[PDB]
Design a protein around this ligand. Structure first.
Ligand SMILES: O=C(/C=C/N1C[C@H]2C[C@@H]1CN2c1ccccn1)c1ccccc1O
Ligand SMILES: [Zn+2]
Length: 110
């Protein structure tokens, strides 16, 4: 019920495609490179999180409110903006996914 509405919102943010390109913005954010693939990420970033983890925290009842879900999504995006350079595509995708989240959330809340 809360779990299922959290699921719906995340599935739709994951599925979201850029208008002109049709590119699925979430794609790089689904799953972080492993600690051995990219140790720099884990040195720089304090609370690593990817969409796979967010889906696990949902399934495991770790979010008490839609606000707690939003907080972890906004953190994934913040972490992307810290690791990647301003002016990079990945950085900007994380920026855009902030408003995709809030839009999807609103629609679903209604
Ligand atoms: O910043 C994120 C990922 C950046 N990576 C993905 C590609 C582009 C950049 C460097 N990449 C590498 C680097 C080494 C191995 C695999 N991918 C990121 C991914 C999931 C959740 C949050 C994130 O910040
Ligand atoms: Zn519960």
């Amino acid at each position: 019920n809360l779990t299922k509405k959290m699921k719906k919102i995340v599935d739709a943010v994951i599925k979201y495609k850029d208008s002109s390109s049709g590119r699925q913005l979430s794609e790089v954010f689904i799953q972080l490179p492993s600690r051995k693939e990219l140790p720099e990420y884990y040195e720089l970033i304090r609370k690593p999180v990817d969409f796979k983890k967010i889906k696990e925290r949902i399934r495991n009842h770790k979010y008490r409110s839609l606000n707690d879900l939003e907080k972890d999504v906004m953190l994934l995006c913040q972490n992307a903006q810290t690791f990647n350079l301003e002016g990079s595509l990945i950085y900007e995708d994380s920026i855009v996914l902030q408003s995709v989240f809030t839009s999807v959330r609103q629609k679903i809340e209604k």
